[model samples]
Structure formats: structure tokens, C-alpha cells
Target: MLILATLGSDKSVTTINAILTEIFTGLNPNKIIIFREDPQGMEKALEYLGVNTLIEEKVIGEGIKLWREKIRNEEIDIFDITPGRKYMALSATYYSRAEEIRYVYLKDEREGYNIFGYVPFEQLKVINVRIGDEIPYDPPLTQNVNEAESLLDVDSLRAFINILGLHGKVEINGIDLENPDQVEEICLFRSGKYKYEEEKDIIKEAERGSLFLADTNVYIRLGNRLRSLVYNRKYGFRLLSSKNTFNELYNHTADENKVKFILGMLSYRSLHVPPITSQVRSSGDMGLINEALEIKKNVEDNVVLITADKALGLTAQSKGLRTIILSKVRKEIGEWDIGELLFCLSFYNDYRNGIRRMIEISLNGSKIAELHSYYHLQERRVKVRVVDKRYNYPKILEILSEILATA
Candidate 1:
């Protein structure tokens, strides 16, 4: 058995020795591995106290290869993750493959000097593995389109728009490009007429009606699915933009097929706020804040400026408007990043292969490509957005659903 731990500034050699001695009192490990962000500090501490067992030291940022190889070779017995820095603990946790993992942390109680607690893998319920049949979804007979949009990856934004159009709640005007100012007039129709000399005021008024605005980051980081959802909203939100926003999207789009998707969204929703003719003079992000303020001033509803930008949200609050920051929303909604989602999805691939194979597949998988690839890979059906209920493997649909609704 081997003991793995990380070194930190707050921890001393005495503290480390005490914790290890208390935690692994009976089962003596032959080897100990200590990972440190500051290797020099670790060496000095170790030099102060002569070691008993063999010791190997490593730098934290040298990548996970060393840890991965050791764990794969079944060399590690117990990992002391609680003592390390955050990233080190995370890296160790990610690569750890053994069933009997141990975590120990310092806790002050009883006598003033007494500090330490032990949590083993079996009693903790820290690891969750669904090893049998697929997770069933007994979806309601009637589904909410917005709720469905947030949850279902199989259905596109266009499909939702088509449903809305069928119900006479939406129209596909295709954002007429003949007059650039005319598009602005339609967007700010509630605010007032467009004035040429009062161009700055026109821009400001147009901006104020937005509950949320899609920035270039939204278009890029979250990908087209999220970008389209925000752009397609007809009321209670607006796309705050300059001509450059659309142009940047156009030029940066690697796949033309994705371009087709964007175009379809615009044509259906009539999202013409982002023009093709001329660029606005003001900063792109500040313009969104001013737009959100306009909505707060003019509209009676609870005004919220949705964004991923932390500074932008603070700036909006400073200007007296509510902000819905996506990062904060992600925490409340219990969402995972692309990597974790892919890892979980691999579970539904084949149960017989076990977690080792699942981890390998997740390491090599592409979240965006694997998701959108279904358009070509799967067979088409009679319905527009209604997917085969059996293919809801990753819950990509549900993940994106909350992503859109939260924003």
C-alpha cells in the first residue's frame, strides 16, 4: 500500500506526520508520494525531519501523467486529498481509480490542539455509479416548449420557433436588410421614432428594452445553441448588438453548416438588431448595460440583464438594474461543464465495459461534435423536433434547457 499527499504553506511536517499516523494507524503503507506546488518548501520541511519510508516528490503543474500512470499501475493505496491546494486535490481526485479512497482534513474540536477527521469511501457515499439499466424519464403527456427547449438537445431552436409560429405567437420576418435604420426602428418601436442627430439617444433607447443581450462570448463559449435561444426571444428580452457582432459570428464560424443554423434562427425570429451595413461607435458591452437600464425604466416587469461577465453584472447593478449572471446560475441549477457531461454520457454507452473504459472514452470525446453529429448520424422522422425518447443519453437537452432559461 502507498500513501499519497500534497504539501501546503499552512501545513508543517509535524502536522502531516500526526495526521498520517492517526489516519493510517494499522495498515502501514510501504511508500509515500508527496505532490507540492512549491517543491523547495516541501524538501526543506522533509529535510527538517528524517523520513521513515521511501518518498517521491513531484511538482503539481507538471500535468497528471505521473499520477495517472501510478494509479493505472495500481501503486497507490490511500490518497490524503484534504491537505493539498484546490487544484492538486481536484487533479488527484480525477485520476484516482481505486474503490477504497480515503480523505482526511484538520478539524479543531475537544481540546484546542486536537484537529483531524477521517472519511473512507464506503461510508461517505461520495462516489455515485448507476450500474444497471438506463435512467428512465416518464415525461408528462403535455410538455412546456420553453421547459423542453431548456432540456432537449435533439430539438433545435428553429423547431421551437416553428411550434410558436404554428400557435400564432411568432412570425418569420427574415430581418429586412434594405434599410439599416429601419431595423433599429422595429427593435425600439416601443421606445420611440429614430432621430438621425439624436443617434446616440436612439441607440440608448433601443438598448433599454433588453432583458438580456447576447455578447460575442455568448455566441462563442456556449456555442450556437445558446446564442440562438437568446436571439430568438420576441419579448422580455432583445439582442443588443452592433453590425460587428453579426460580422464576427459570420467570419469566425468554422462550419458553414452552423452558419445555416444561425441564418435559420434569424430568419424565423426577425432578430435584425445586429445589422450588416454599419458598425456602432460605442463599446459593445457597455451598450448592453444601457439597453438593460432602458428596459428597467420603460418596462413594468422585473428587469434582468443576463450575462456571463462578472464585471458587467456589477456595472449593471451600479446603474440600478438587476443582473442574472450565468456563472452564479450554473451553481444553483446543478450543471456540469462539457468534460463532466461527456464522462457521464459514456456510462450510457455500454454498462458491461465498466468505469475504466468510460473514463478513457470521456478523455477522448468531443462534447460539441458528438452532440451536433446526431443531425447526420441518426435517421429522420415524421416530426420536426420530437426526438426518439430513447436517445436522451447525456441529458444534453436538459442541461441546455436550464442554461437558456437561467439567462
Candidate 2:
């Protein structure tokens, strides 16, 4: 058996799917026996693997043991197994079975949002977590399924059939408002408790499977910077803006010009124009709205809305949505390392990582990770090195520093 890499922590779990997709090319998850422990971890694992069923196990008991037993009797090949609890489960499982297992350590190094590939077991043993600790998210999470589809391994074509068996399973999560029946149905599948925690009543919408709407600032910002970043007609990101923001942009001469230019440029690249979706204005949090919409569409959505705006992000969480409060850490100067610059130019030939400036627009991924939910999910933790005035100073600074040290 090809003992694949093991993803232990939440951070590692987030990026593993992307890596798997890249390397496995023709990878069929069905052939893979993926075992997920009870609670949110199981849901997370399934989502990462693109499976749709919300698991039904109540606690992290011998469910995995039962799964393994069933696996032996079944004709399935690939399997993903997890034992719920983080620290305790990870340690206990490893202590019992430490043979040839590879651990993938997702370092949330905040230099720039980048995944630092899989880490070997020995490498993980020496790693530390304190350096990348994020904010606390304490919420009541219950595990039990009443209406949702069974946690059948999706590798089997019986997914649609299983959904039929499960009647009340609502496949959406970003609801803005849900009636009592709809709410109970969601609550039933979520933790088996058909009631919401009284204290969290303010977040009632989320308790019923609807996340608070997010704002559209991030999308608009991207659209606004399209010209400054030199996103040409052929290469543009389809960044939809809010009606309110769009109106503001349209009225504000400077914002209007920049937005129009960006739309035109993006049109050339065939990057679809950012539509002013209805929720853009009617809804308060555009980012959250986008995320919820994506989630409802059954997409394994993840985003860290980076903004100096903290209250907006909070409102999203109060609505049971995820968000990140971005800090201000921007580089004012522009600098380029000659030899390295030449090499990059030669490599991309057609498109320099952003020509002219060699490293024109640079953002620290590690720092981004530290700031929000979306960035924090990436593996840019360890190699997060920061240098001030990277652009303003000359590249020769490195050589001069080395020369001074030689004395």
C-alpha cells in the first residue's frame, strides 16, 4: 500500500487537497479509503476531499474502528480515517501505530500566502505551533445527523441514492434567513439538538445554517487595483463589486476611472466582468455573502477577507461566517535583486512574475496568514521572512552587508 502523507492539523488539512489534486492528476478519491473522525473534523475532511455527506457519529468513539471493520468486508480500496480530537487523538493514534506514516506539517508562515508542501514525519516532530497561533474560535458544535445524507464514501456512485434515504438533509449553509422548520432541519443534522444555545441567539441565523453576509470591499479593492497592478485585457481576475461600492466608485471620479479601466482590461483577458450581484448592496457583508453563496453551491469554499475593517469581519462571525481582520503591513519602497531578477525574467519569458519592477507588487504571505481566516488556512508559516523598505533600498545591500561581515 502506498502510505500517503498524513495531514494532522487544521492548517495542514486545508492545503493538502490542493497538493493532492496537483500530484495525483487522475486521482479518484473513491478508490481512496478516507476515514474521518466524528464532529467537524469529519465534515472538514470530507469537504477537503470533495465529499458531500455530513457525518452522523455522535462522539469520537470506536466509529473509526467500526469503519475499519466495514472496510475489511467491503471491496473498497482507498480509505481516509481520522479520530476526531486534535492533540489527544493525534498523539494516541501515532503512539499505537508509528510505522512508516508520513506527517504533513502545514506551516502557516505568514510571508505571502503560499503552501510549503508536505512535511515529513521527522520534520514535523521538530516543529513548533506557538509561532503560528491564531485567534480563538469558541462555538458550540454538535455532531449527529438526522436529515442529511449518510457519510457514505463518495467513491461509490450511491451518493444521490443516499441523499434520497436522508430526507431532511439541507445541502446549503449560507442562508441569510431560515424559517423555523428550515432551522430545525439544519439544527437536527448539525448536532442532533433541535434547539439553539440561548446565549448565541444573536447569531441565530448562523445557528440555523446561515452565515452572516460579508461585505464586498475585498472584491472591489481587487477591481480597483487592476489598473495599478497592470492586469492587462488578456489576464484579469473577474472581480464582482457591490452595487453600493460600484455606485461609490462610479460617482467618485478617481474610483470611476480606475474601475472602468479595470473592467475593460479584465474583459480583454476574458476574465468575466464583476457583476454587481443583488446582495452587494441589499446585503451588508459582501465578502461573507460571497463565501456563503459559494458554500451553498456545494463548493469547498475558503477565504480570509483581509481588511483593516474588523467590525465587518466580526459581524460575519456573529452570523456564523468566517473572516479575518487584516493588519496594515505594506511596503512603500521597491527594490530588485539583479541576478535573481534576470533569472525570473528568463523563466517566465512571456510574463515576468510582473515584469518592469521584477518583483513589482509584493505582499507577505506569512503576514497575510497571521491576519485572517482565509490566509491563516495556508501553509506559509515557517519561511516567513520580512525586510523593511524592500523596494526602496538597492539590492547591493546584501553584498555590502556580507562584505562588512568578512572584516
Candidate 3:
């Protein structure tokens, strides 16, 4: 078994040690390996804590090689890494082919803490923008990256993610002129966080503080999918669905267990239950038709559609509404970058520059490239996106369903 963590600050180290000790009470000192951002600088840090562990090492390519050997040989009893300093953890995690890896992400005073586990090999997925996959096009001023323009436009980040399903990696260089290595590392930017710019007082219109619209697939992922919406009680990010989104969900009910799992795990203040309109279910189109109309009318509404489909985002964009796509699953390979998630929302028109911006503001901006590269080399699909809201979900999903089912 191996544990991964990040050392963000002095406080983070203390917290990590406490957590590691608790999780592995009889942990062998020799089996543990600690990689710091800078060994020379961190040595003082270790001394400050009166901590003595022979396992400590610096974060770099060599450190990764060392860890990989341990995993390959089953030489180490346990390994620990952090999620606090993401870039370093990502480098170590991506390079090391451990049998099993778990993430210990700690939150500041108000954020709390979350520990996520994964079978690196099993959970990882990737989507590659192969030579055949790239499509040449005269992208509109609103779009970039001709191949899979829809994906490059609004859902780039999520598109990248979905291509690399849950934990897979993606290596795509031919599509963009950027160095494959640089593009790959950028993939690890903050992937889980979602944000939208305040426009037309949209936030004020909602009775709730805020609402995040999700595409049908979000529910599918949840399985045991809840009819109710989820609320980020901690940050007040609430979940919602258009009647159109609801009916679309009903149409694809093949995976009921996943739905149940989703609802069971979700936490919310109150599920935003939109009026169940017959228009959604009345027509084969379900509520998608009406939802499209609603989205068009309320262009200022700060709604985010979580979808892996591209057409949905493009249609939403046509309506002048901001849209966010849920990235399609890439072949299993590695982890998702929260920054990539942000890019999915901000990727349009910016392309490489936009990605660079993400790295600039990234928690571990300097090292993000390495993380992104590791996944790309593995042929993982990383999410890419643009922040335009002119696409529709129904038509988009309809088209995507055809493409995906053929596989």
C-alpha cells in the first residue's frame, strides 16, 4: 500500500505526519518515502520539526524513478504523498507505477479535508487527439483548435477529461503546436474547481445564492442518480437541472446503479427541482427542447452544464449563454487537474496562452507542466475548454450519443 500527500506549509507537514501515523500506526520507517519540493531547503524544515525519517527525498524525476522501482519490486510496505502541493504530488504520482495510490487532500481552516483513493491503473483513462481524430476547420472568432472544434471551444477541458476517463492519461501533440510535454503538464491545473464570471446580475436572479446546471451525464456518473440537485454546502455552490436535462437523463437509464451511487454520495441543502414540464417528456426530445428555449431567454443566468458532449456546449454558446461541459472519459491513465476543469470553462480563444494563464495562477504553476506531461505521455485525455455559452444540450447530446454508441 502507498500513501501520497503534499507539503504546502509547515502546518501541512504537521498535519501530514499526524495523518500518516494514524493511518499506519505500525508503519515501518524504512518503507516510508517522503519527497520534498527542495531537499536542501526542506532539510531545515525537517530539522525544525525534530523529525527524522531516512525515507525523505527531494521532488524530481529521479525521486519518481526511485518510487517506481519500489512499486515494481514491491519493496516498500507503504508510501505517502500529499494533495496540498499538487504539482509535486502529481509528478511523483504520475511517474510512479504503484499498485495502489491514495490522495490525502487537506483543506484550510474553512475548507475541511478530503481523502480520495484510487487504483491508479484501473481508474486511469485517456483520450488522444490522434492524427485521424483531428479535424481541420475555419474556427469562428469564438472558437479555436479546428479538430473537434466543439471540444476546443467550450468543452475542451472536460472533453479532454472524458477522453481520458476517470483516472486515465492522454497524450495529444499533433493537434496543437505546443510541445507535447508542456501541454501535458498543464493538464494537472486545478481540475475539480468550477467557476463562472458574474454577468447581468444573474447570481441575483436565483432564489438560492447560486446554481450550477449539469448536463445529463453528471447524473449518470452519480448513479443512484438523485432527482434532487446537489449543493456545495461548504461554498454554497448549488446543483440544478433544466427540465430538458431531466428528461434526457430519464432516456438513458441503462446504468441505474451508478445513478443511485451518485445520489447516495451527494450532499445538498435542497435539490432545485425545476417544474416537471410535460414539454420535456411529451416530445422525444424531452425537456431539452424547452430548456434550450429557457437558456436562450435567460442568457445572463450563471448556469453551468456538466456534459461530456460537445454539441451541447456549442448550441448553448450559440444562444449567448455561458456553458461548461463535463469532459468525456479518457482511457484510464492518471488523475484530473482542477486547473484543467477551469480551462474547460475558460479555454475558448485563449488556447496555449489560456493554459499558460492557468499555470501562472496554479498552486504549483511551475511544476504543472511535468504533471501534465506525465499523463500525456501515457496517452491520457485531459480536459480543455472555452468560456462561451452559445450551445444547446439536446441536439448536442443527440449527436454525441450516435458517435459514442458506435464505439
Most accurate candidate by lDDT: 1
For TM-score, the strongest prediction is 3
lDDT of 2 by residue, 164-245 (tens): 1122221211121245232222222222122222213213222333222223333222222222222223433212333443
Candidate 1 TM-score to native: 0.25
lDDT of 3: 0.34
The number of residue pairs in model 3 that clash at the backbone is 104
Task: Give per-residue CA lDDT, model 1, range 1-407, as digits (tens).
Answer: 45544334244432353333323233344456666555543232222223235556655444456545543443465555655555556656667654444443223322112111121111221111213222221211122222111223323322232222222333222123245232222222111221122223223433455434444444333332333334322353344443334544555443323433343233323344455344343436776666555546775655555555778878878988766554521121321122212221222233222232212111112211122112223332111122322222223323323433342
- Error (Å) of candidate 1 at residue 129 is 32
Q: Write the per-residue lDDT of candidate 3 for residues 101-178, one digit (tens) a residue.
A: 444323232222211111121322111112212112111111121222222212223332232232223333223324
State each model's CA lDDT, in order. 0.37, 0.28, 0.34
lDDT of 2: 0.28
Where is model 3 more than 4 Å wrong at Cα? 1-23, 27-210, 221-235, 254-279, 282-289, 295-300, 304-306, 326-407
> Better model by TM-score, 2 or 3?
3
Candidate 2: residue 292 lDDT (0-100): 53
State every prediction's TM-score relative to the real structure: 0.25, 0.24, 0.27
